[PDB]
Ligand binder design. Structure first.
Ligand SMILES: Nc1ncnc2c1ncn2[C@@H]1O[C@H](CSCC[C@H](N)C(=O)O)[C@@H](O)[C@H]1O
Ligand SMILES: Nc1ncnc2c1ncn2[C@@H]1O[C@H](CSCC[C@H](N)C(=O)O)[C@@H](O)[C@H]1O
Lengths: 355, 351
């Protein structure tokens, strides 16, 4: 907390207005945290501290920065609980926890660096233009070189979502009678780095997976499959997935963080294509930010979904669609939803061909 | 909360890393809230809803916006608890609470609009350049256009601070029937002085600020009914001519703009302007020399220092540094008082 709420006591109209103003101000200054964290990334702070903890003066020397400003930046990161700081008689030493090392450094499996760079290069300028997008809207009538360049960074920056999602999905798949000793096949449409598929392949040693994405992303996905030891059972088909050629006979077709990019018309097209690629008894899994039609921020997942929709508007995307809309798309594809599972920031919808 | 933490439990190394990643992501997406709130201001959303609650389609018609994007924006504001939304059979209606109407609309006493505009015009672009400022530093050897907006946008800090200060002044034997005089150095809208004048009906106050801000301050004094006891002296307060004989000299949100050398100069000038038994009050973001984020005020002070670096400002100074400045001016601190986001230091001439 950045406001001592115990000092905002009172129940007059003025008291309540002043208290609200402090709370709104605290919300507004949430701007500062990404600015500090992303500046630290740009300067190399996290990689430097992971290699060798140091005081602000040493870090400023190593990173060719101003010593006073570096101390301010590091103490702000400490105040955000992003880095740790030990105080001795000699002085201070800043360092990263093992968890932060894994999240903040380039090149790790769960690195947020891709999210830092998406913010720096794309989201920060776009958010400043949000009013203009709300004024003018967007039209409904593959990713171009711009969006592909953006995804090149972003896909690695959202790897951290995958493990809880795959653990939940895998538990349901096992409980539904799907064995890791079966030679099942998975299709991962718009696979990004392929982490969802690749974690499934680690969980189910006899399965194989095919990921669809554009060429530059498919390259990243194959490299990560090798890093995860599943290279022999993971393959990519590079190109625009609207050009068909998905293969057939899949026991699982996965759409993670894909449907919110679509229009209703394109969503129905994708769902029907998935249904045509299913093996007997195959399943479609949708992982996305989904909210009830009442659009109430009841749960963390609902609240995030409503905020994420603003992010989609910010970059000219689709929407946080409702459960009811996904139901219509399942029906249009001859599928019926069999399960809805909560995950930390998403829902999983599982569907099979209607009986 | 935007993350269902009950679904990130576990104590393996991987479990802990993935949980931290979700928590860091949640921190990063704090960017979205000012963007949504400030876009809504730019579009006229808050003023429109305060006048007449409406569904998203009606508001889109009234504000000449896209209906789908307006619904997204309004539901995001609802998710942030900035606006309220009622669901009937007819449909939805968005509206503002009385508290929000006072905070979000232009022209109210506690309006955050000046903070919205400071962000839009100044802070947003600057924060994107923070790495360059850290690389290159700042020296010790536009802002007026900015302050014209920002000073009204920080009025909301004043009432809790003045209530705390006034309580201490009364407990220290200062009467509202005394013809005491206050100097408010860099007074901004003058709200601190003006609230003191309401609390202490026989006091008078002089605010120092640049001409355009002094104009705002005199207009607000009239709005608060204290016009006969509040006056401004317009100009650069480094050019002297502060007057003398003040029972209270107030520096609110001023010292963090200074260098150590300029801070000592200001403190000494205040001391020379004090009546016998006069007090200096410093209201600022102040932290212990250990710079530990123990309390909300300490944590905010450390983050505010980054905001100062962002705009090429001073620092969140330490209690120990203010003590040195008091000593250099022949003053001694007699009290430290916490407020929601600041500390008040009170000092008198040392005996
Ligand atoms: N028409 C298209 N053809 C191929 N890939 C596409 C595509 N439209 C979007 N994509 C890909 O879909 C992905 C969206 S981001 C989601 C990636 C991954 N499923 C995850 O959840 O982590 C990107 O990798 C993007 O390149
Ligand atoms: N040299 C100078 N001469 C006059 N006013 C100055 C000044 N340097 C800064 N100021 C004023 O100091 C104020 C800083 S903002 C703080 C305003 C007010 N005390 C409050 O706490 O709300 C601005 O109004 C700015 O114009």
């Amino acid at each position: 907390s950045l406001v001592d709420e115990s000092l905002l006591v009172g129940v007059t109209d003025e008291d309540r207005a002043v208290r609200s103003a402090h709370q709104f101000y605290e919300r507004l200054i949430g701007l500062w945290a990404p600015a500090v964290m992303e500046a630290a990334h740009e300067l190399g702070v996290f990689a430097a501290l992971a290699e060798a903890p140091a005081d602000s003066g040493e870090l400023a020397r190593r990173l060719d920065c101003d010593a006073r400003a570096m101390r301010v930046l590091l103490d702000a990161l400490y105040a955000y609980d992003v880095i740790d700081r030990i105080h001795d008689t000699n002085g201070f030493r800043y360092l990263l926890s093992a968890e932060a090392r894994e999240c903040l450094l380039p090149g790790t499996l769960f690195s947020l660096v891709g999210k830092f760079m998406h913010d720096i290069n794309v989201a920060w300028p776009a958010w400043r233009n949000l009013a203009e997008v709300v004024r003018h809207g967007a039209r409904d009538t593959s990713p171009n070189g711009i969006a592909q360049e953006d995804y090149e960074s972003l896909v690695g920056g959202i790897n951290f979502w995958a493990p809880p999602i795959v653990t939940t999905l895998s538990r349901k798949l096992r409980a539904s009678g799907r064995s890791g000793d079966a030679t099942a096949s998975v299709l991962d449409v718009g696979c990004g780095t392929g982490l969802y598929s690749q974690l499934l392949l680690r969980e189910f040693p006899r399965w194989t997976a095919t990921g669809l994405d554009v060429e530059r992303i498919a390259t990243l996905a194959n490299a990560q499959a090798l890093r995860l030891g599943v290279e022999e059972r993971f393959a990519t088909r590079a190109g625009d997935f609207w050009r068909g050629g998905w293969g057939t006979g899949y026991d699982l077709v996965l759409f993670a963080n894909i449907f919110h990019l679509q229009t209703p018309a394109s969503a129905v097209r994708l769902m029907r294509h998935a249904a045509a690629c299913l093996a007997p008894d195959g399943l479609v899994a949708v992982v996305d930010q989904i909210v009830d039609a009442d659009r109430e921020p009841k749960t963390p997942q609902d609240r995030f979904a409503l905020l994420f929709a603003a992010s989609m508007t910010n970059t000219g995307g689709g929407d946080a669609y409702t459960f009811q809309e996904y139901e219509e798309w399942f029906t249009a594809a001859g599928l019926q939803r069999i399960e809805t599972l909560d995950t930390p920031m998403h829902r999983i919808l599982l569907a099979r061909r209607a009986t």
